Design a protein around this ligand. Structure first.
Ligand code: CL
Length: 291
């Protein structure tokens, strides 16, 4: 049988190898994962778009089968650095026009920021469990994740992630309704199997979430793209999750005010691709076909 790792192509980006799935021809349909996942997150959704365009699912730097950075430490794998690598990869792959984005979690921070700064290049944005606000208070943070994220953002974070791999080992199964199979879980573990800095991307990401204005750079760029999303006529497909995690309550009401928006609801907590892949794939296919 052909494994997932086996299907990947590779590009040299600032001297580092970045892995990605690419299949088909036509305008790009770009699938962006977040933390602590990889292109594997899209494996059951991509077949619903087969023959509809050029499907591209990159592994972010330090994740999936992409290279790890050199002398990784607490300043490594920030949002800015992820932009540097991903945006360069996208340019190298000729993702420049008529782009459909299918985005989740930190992949949505990256994708929304890309769309905002390449606003004439975008055919449509499908998003789910996405970065769609900055939080003025920890009170606004998801109840089920607050203790975990407060501890990750503290000095405790290195031991929790670099040693104990808790983003993978606790947050992943906690954020899926079903149980992943052993094979599926082992594929998420694989890029992070080695203790130490190999796991750093999964710790810098929670430290980059904009809460009480910190970090400042991420807060500003998210605020900027959220303002723009409330105005732009670019078609939007909001895949709402029931119950969801990141997009719930008041946040969800605000998303529903965005222009040119189609909404579908599917079962899921946060990694909803694992609970409702066929519902998500069919929704993306049908919406993309209507554009
Ligand atoms: Cl995170």
């Amino acid at each position: 049988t052909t494994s997932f790792r086996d299907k990947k192509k590779f590009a040299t980006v600032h001297g580092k190898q970045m892995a990605y799935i690419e299949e088909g021809t036509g305008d790009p349909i770009v699938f962006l994962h977040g933390n602590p996942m990889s292109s594997y997150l899209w494996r059951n959704i991509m077949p619903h778009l087969a023959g509809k365009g050029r499907l591209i699912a990159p592994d972010l730097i330090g994740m999936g089968d992409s290279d790890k950075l050199d002398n990784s430490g607490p300043d490594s794998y920030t949002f800015a650095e992820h932009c540097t690598y991903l945006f360069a990869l996208l340019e190298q792959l000729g993702v420049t026009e008529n782009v459909t984005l299918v985005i989740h979690d930190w992949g949505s921070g990256l994708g929304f920021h890309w769309a905002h700064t390449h606003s004439d290049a975008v055919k449509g944005i499908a998003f789910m469990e996405a970065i769609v606000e900055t939080r003025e208070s920890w009170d606004a943070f998801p109840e089920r994740a607050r203790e975990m994220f407060q501890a990750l953002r503290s000095p405790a974070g290195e031991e929790m992630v670099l040693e104990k791999n808790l983003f993978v080992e606790a947050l992943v199964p906690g954020s899926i309704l079903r149980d992943l199979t052993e094979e599926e879980m082992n594929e998420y573990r694989r890029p992070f199997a080695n203790a130490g800095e190999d796991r750093r991307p999964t710790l810098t990401f929670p430290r980059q979430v904009p809460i009480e204005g910190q970090p400042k750079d991420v807060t500003e760029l998210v605020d900027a793209y959220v303002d723009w999303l409330g105005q732009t006529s670019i078609p939007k497909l909001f895949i709402n999750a029931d119950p969801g995690v990141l997009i719930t309550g008041e946040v969800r009401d605000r998303v529903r005010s965005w222009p040119n928006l189609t909404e579908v609801t599917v079962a899921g907590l946060h990694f909803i691709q694992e609970d409702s892949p066929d519902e998500i794939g069919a929704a993306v296919r049908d919406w993309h076909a209507s554009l």
